[PDB]
Paper text:
Here, we describe variants with all combinations of the aliphatic residues, Ile, Leu and Val, at a and d to give four classes of peptide: the ββ class, with a and d = Ile or Val; Lβ, a = Leu and d = Ile or Val; βL, a = Ile or Val and d = Leu; and LL, a = d = Leu. In summary, solution-phase data and X-ray crystal structures demonstrate conclusively that different classes of Type-2 coiled-coil (CC) peptides—i.e., based on abcdefg repeats with predominantly hydrophobic residues at a, d, e and g—adopt a range of distinct states.
Mutating Ile→Phe to give [name] rendered another collapsed structure, but with eight helices in two 21-symmetric 4-helix bundles interfaced by unusual bifurcated helices. Thus, the bulk of Phe cannot substitute for β-branching at d to maintain open α-helical barrels. Despite the complexity of these Phe-containing structures, they are CCs founded on KIH packing. Similarly, the sequences with bulky Phe at a or d fit poorly to most structures other than their own.
Residue numbers in the entry:
A (entry chain G), C (entry chain F), E (entry chain A), F (entry chain B), G (entry chain C): 1 to 30
B (entry chain H), D (entry chain E), H (entry chain D): 1 to 29
């Protein structure tokens, strides 16, 4: 319910964090 | 309930961290 | 229900985080 | 059913994340 | 229940780890 | 039954993973 | 059944990984 | 069936990651 929706919101933010981290890693690779 | 509010707070923080990493990645270009 | 759906979305996001962290490890190494 | 499927996908992601943590730990030294 | 508690604790830890990665990245970029 | 016991053991192991991940996040600071 | 047994096996493995990660983190702290 | 086998394979790999990480920790000291 409220917990499931908040976990979905957390998951989406975590996914976006992952993609930003990968972008940073790739910038470190030039 | 209390767990839902905590998860929302963590999501908020992750959004902020992701923006900073994207700024850092641009700085390395 | 929605809880299982949220757990599946959490799993996908955590998988993306795994790939991102590996990329960062690659960038640190070489 | 869908809950068992979600648990299995979550376990797989936990395993992949643990592998990445192990890889990251190796890279730190 | 305990699984919901565990997901919350793990989400909290992921968030703290994400902060630590962001700080590490900040140092690497100068 | 045995599934509920397995889920409880999984929840407790996930909490241990949470504790370890917070420990690792702190170790990146220093 | 076998799913619950395998989930218990996975939980034990996850606990062992968490302990190893915690040990690494605390060794990194010094 | 397939889910139980998957979980067992993940568990086997997880413990192997743990043993590698334990070795990394010992090398630090």
């Amino acid at each position: 319910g409220e917990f499931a929706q908040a976990l979905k919101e957390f998951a989406k933010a975590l996914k976006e964090f992952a993609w930003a981290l990968k972008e940073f890693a790739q910038a470190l690779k030039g």
